[PDB]
Amino acid sequence: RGRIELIIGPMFAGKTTELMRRVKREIHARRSCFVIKYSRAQAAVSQLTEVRDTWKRFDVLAIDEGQFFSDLVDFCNTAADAGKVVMVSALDGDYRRKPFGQICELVPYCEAVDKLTAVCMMCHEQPACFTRRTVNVEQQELIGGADMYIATCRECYSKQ
Amino acid sequence: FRGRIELIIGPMFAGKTTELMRRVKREIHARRSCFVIKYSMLRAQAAVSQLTEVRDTWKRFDVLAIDEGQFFSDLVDFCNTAADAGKVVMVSALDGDYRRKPFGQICELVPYCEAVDKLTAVCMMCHEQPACFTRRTVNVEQQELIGGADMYIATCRECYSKQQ
Amino acid sequence: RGRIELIIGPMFAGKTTELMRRVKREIHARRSCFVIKYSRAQAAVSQLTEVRDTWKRFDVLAIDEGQFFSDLVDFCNTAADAGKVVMVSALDGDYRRKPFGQICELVPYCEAVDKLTAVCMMCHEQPACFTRRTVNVEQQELIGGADMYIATCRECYSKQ
Amino acid sequence: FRGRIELIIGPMFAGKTTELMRRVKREIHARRSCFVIKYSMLRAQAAVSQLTEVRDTWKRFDVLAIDEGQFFSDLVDFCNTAADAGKVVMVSALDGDYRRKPFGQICELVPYCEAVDKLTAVCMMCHEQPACFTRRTVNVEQQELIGGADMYIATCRECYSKQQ
Numbered sequence: 001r002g003r004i005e006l007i008i009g010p011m012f013a014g015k016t017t018e019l020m021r022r023v024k025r026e027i028h029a030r031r032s033c034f035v036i037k038y039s040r041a042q043a044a045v046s047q048l049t050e051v052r053d054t055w056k057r058f059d060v061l062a063i064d065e066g067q068f069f070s071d072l073v074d075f076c077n078t079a080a081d082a083g084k085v086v087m088v089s090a091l092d093g094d095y096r097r098k099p100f101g102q103i104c105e106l107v108p109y110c111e112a113v114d115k116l117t118a119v120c121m122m123c124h125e126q127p128a129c130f131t132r133r134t135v136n137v138e139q140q141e142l143i144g145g146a147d148m149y150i151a152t153c154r155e156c157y158s159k160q
Numbered sequence: 161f162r163g164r165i166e167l168i169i170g171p172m173f174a175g176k177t178t179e180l181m182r183r184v185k186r187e188i189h190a191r192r193s194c195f196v197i198k199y200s201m202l203r204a205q206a207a208v209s210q211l212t213e214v215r216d217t218w219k220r221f222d223v224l225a226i227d228e229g230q231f232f233s234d235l236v237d238f239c240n241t242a243a244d245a246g247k248v249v250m251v252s253a254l255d256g257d258y259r260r261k262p263f264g265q266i267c268e269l270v271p272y273c274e275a276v277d278k279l280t281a282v283c284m285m286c287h288e289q290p291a292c293f294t295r296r297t298v299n300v301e302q303q304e305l306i307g308g309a310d311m312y313i314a315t316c317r318e319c320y321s322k323q324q
Numbered sequence: 325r326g327r328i329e330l331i332i333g334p335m336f337a338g339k340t341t342e343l344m345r346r347v348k349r350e351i352h353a354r355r356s357c358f359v360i361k362y363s364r365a366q367a368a369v370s371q372l373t374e375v376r377d378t379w380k381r382f383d384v385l386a387i388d389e390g391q392f393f394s395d396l397v398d399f400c401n402t403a404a405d406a407g408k409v410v411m412v413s414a415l416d417g418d419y420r421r422k423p424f425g426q427i428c429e430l431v432p433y434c435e436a437v438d439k440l441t442a443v444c445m446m447c448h449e450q451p452a453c454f455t456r457r458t459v460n461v462e463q464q465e466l467i468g469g470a471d472m473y474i475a476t477c478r479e480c481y482s483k484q
Numbered sequence: 485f486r487g488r489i490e491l492i493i494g495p496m497f498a499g500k501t502t503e504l505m506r507r508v509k510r511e512i513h514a515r516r517s518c519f520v521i522k523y524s525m526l527r528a529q530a531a532v533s534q535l536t537e538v539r540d541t542w543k544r545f546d547v548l549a550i551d552e553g554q555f556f557s558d559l560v561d562f563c564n565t566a567a568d569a570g571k572v573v574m575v576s577a578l579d580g581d582y583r584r585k586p587f588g589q590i591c592e593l594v595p596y597c598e599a600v601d602k603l604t605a606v607c608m609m610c611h612e613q614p615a616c617f618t619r620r621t622v623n624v625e626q627q628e629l630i631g632g633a634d635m636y637i638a639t640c641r642e643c644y645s646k647q648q
């Protein structure tokens with residue numbers, strides 16, 4: 001009775017809000033959730049290995065920014081097979097729409113995948129599924145918000 | 161270039177209001193103006209017992225978010241008027257009461273909606289099954305009894321029909 | 325481990341195709357499905373009462389055109405509480421967008437509700453959620469297809 | 485007035501192809517022209533081992549439906565080209581192989597999709613749990629081995645890791 005659930009989409013689609021909705025949901029039913037942020041129980045780390053066997057002591061595991069963790073697949077699968085509810089929120093693509101981190105390897109292991117949309121910040125009348133980086137950096141990992149990224153539809157992604 | 165009605169339903173503690181607000185924050189981010197109507201340049205939060213206490217205010221916004229849509233008697237016409245004026249109308253509401261009887265005007269609204277999403281909670285009794293109904297814990301009959309976890313729990317089908 | 329699932333939307337949204345998808349799905353896993361059409365096992369009736377306790381002898385019950393059955397709620401709930409998977413495909417609204425049959429009473433009893441869309445037959449570039457009747461009849465129950473009905477978006481529903 | 489990519493994924497016997505065709509029949513009904521590309525005025529069904537065996541034919545239609553999208557190596561660019569030309573591109577495909585390894589080009593395609601829907605089947609072993617993976621029943625290693633229930637079954641997580 002364990003599983004893996006994936007929440008994907010561009011930035012400003014409310015993925016993290018949605019992940020936390022699912023958590024608050026479990027918390028109300030007295031189910032114990034362990035929230036792992038990148039860097040009720042809220043740990044912050046750069047790799048999931050830093051969390052020991054701590055996850056074993058909870059019912060649900062919530063992983064935000066799942067993309068930045070290199071061991072995402074095996075960690076999740078181990079947790080899932082131990083009877084945990086694993087929930088991941090993550091960008092499916094980078095600012096170039098290249099597969100981001102380990103997410104695409106995780107999809108075949110998921111029993112649920114939900115792709116959320118944002119609203120397009122350029123035409124403001126179309127659902128947004130991609131992220132455009134506004135600054136001139138190349139490196140894929142560049143943490144930040146609306147100062148560095150904007151969400152767009154297909155038309156606006158290609159238009160200047 | 162069009163308007164619409166979106167409905168968000170399910171039992172209590174399914175995160176319906178969180179979800180409604182997700183959709184709002186989403187619009188706010190794209191500089192679209194949202195008008196939030198709770199029961200009792202870009203973001204406005206009015207609190208009302210009947211929707212037509214708003215008159216034409218809604219016209220001055222892009223999106224209308226109605227929380228607890230069930231408690232409003234004129235929900236259908238208000239929404240349809242807004243939808244036909246090219247507004248994005250979003251309603252969060254209980255589809256059923258503590259008895260699983262149709263709650264307010266929601267079921268009239270479904271045929272007018274272009275989207276309906278039913279959210280689930282987790283069952284507060286067996287804690288290992290998705291919850292779709294609301295059970296009242298106190299011993300009161302009146303349908304409208306505003307409150308939280310002190311008076312209500314969300315449950316699956318098995319636990320709804322059972323005690324303790 | 326029983327439940328009620330509702331599939332709604334206008335005509336030509338593929339509701340019946342979707343219901344049958346869910347059936348074929350169960351059939352492959354050797355789960356027994358009982359299909360009740362209005363008028364693997366396929367019975368045809370004007371009221372669900374005509375089906376005796378036959379439903380007890382199956383795992384899944386599929387009800388197409390659920391709107392036309394007056395005892396839809398109690399029948400489904402009885403089946404659900406007996407541990408059956410009940411699946412209903414039905415119009416949520418009539419040609420006037422008035423609640424059709426018993427469906428709206430059924431929603432509070434459902435653990436899943438999925439609303440499908442069609443494509444708008446007038447503007448042909450917008451998702452359709454309503455049905456327009458093309459003939460001049462008033463009676464809500466008038467069985468037929470594209471000769472008598474067309475699916476539309478909101479704009480086209482009100483336009484001549 | 486725009487184009488897009490839609491992806492339909494899940495294990496075998498989830499009704500992915502039925503679903504793809506639902507979406508097609510839907511378009512056909514509204515007089516929109518669909519071009520169905522299977523592997524190996526309004527409706528056309530071509531059968532191909534590489535998508536660019538189609539050249540420009542796709543330009544003469546509104547919608548492109550690609551079944552078994554996994555077996556095509558140029559899936560991403562073909563779809564994106566079509567999407568950017570204002571086509572509605574619809575792909576049905578296995579996200580994973582019998583080993584749950586990424587199947588073909590699908591995982592590259594996800595970041596380009598505006599919709600992704602993952603369907604489930606029913607587990608052929610325990611018969612009371614939703615199935616999200618495909619188990620191969622025969623004793624073959626090669627990834628591409630076309631066939632049906634004689635060679636594959638769909639399973640939940642528990643049954644995937646267990647025998648018989």
Ligand SMILES: Cc1cn([C@H]2C[C@H](O)[C@@H](CO)O2)c(=O)[nH]c1=O
Nearest residue numbers: 093094095131140141142143144
């Ligand atoms: C789009 C994108 C976001 N990010 C970052 C910005 C955010 O802090 C986080 C997503 O929530 O990831 C990247 O590192 N690379 C990318 O390509």
Ligand SMILES: Cc1cn([C@H]2C[C@H](O)[C@@H](CO)O2)c(=O)[nH]c1=O
Nearest residue numbers: 257258294303304305306307308
């Ligand atoms: C289920 C249910 C909820 N409520 C109220 C309690 C909460 O204050 C509110 C949930 O937003 O709905 C009723 O008044 N009656 C009911 O039957």
Ligand SMILES: Cc1cn([C@H]2C[C@H](O)[C@@H](CO)O2)c(=O)[nH]c1=O
Nearest residue numbers: 417418419455464465466467468
């Ligand atoms: C829209 C509509 C359809 N129908 C019929 C036509 C179809 O045969 C069936 C829906 O599949 O119901 C009605 O009886 N009343 C209505 O209002």
Ligand SMILES: Cc1cn([C@H]2C[C@H](O)[C@@H](CO)O2)c(=O)[nH]c1=O
Nearest residue numbers: 581582618627628629630631632
């Ligand atoms: C899961 C899986 C399916 N298939 C094929 C079998 C079927 O003919 C086809 C399903 O449409 O995919 C493979 O070739 N390899 C695999 O690993």
Ligand SMILES: [Zn+2]
Nearest residue numbers: 120123153156
């Ligand atoms: Zn745009």
Ligand SMILES: [Zn+2]
Nearest residue numbers: 283286316319
């Ligand atoms: Zn329960």
Ligand SMILES: [Zn+2]
Nearest residue numbers: 444447477480
């Ligand atoms: Zn239209």
Ligand SMILES: [Zn+2]
Nearest residue numbers: 607610640643
């Ligand atoms: Zn199983």
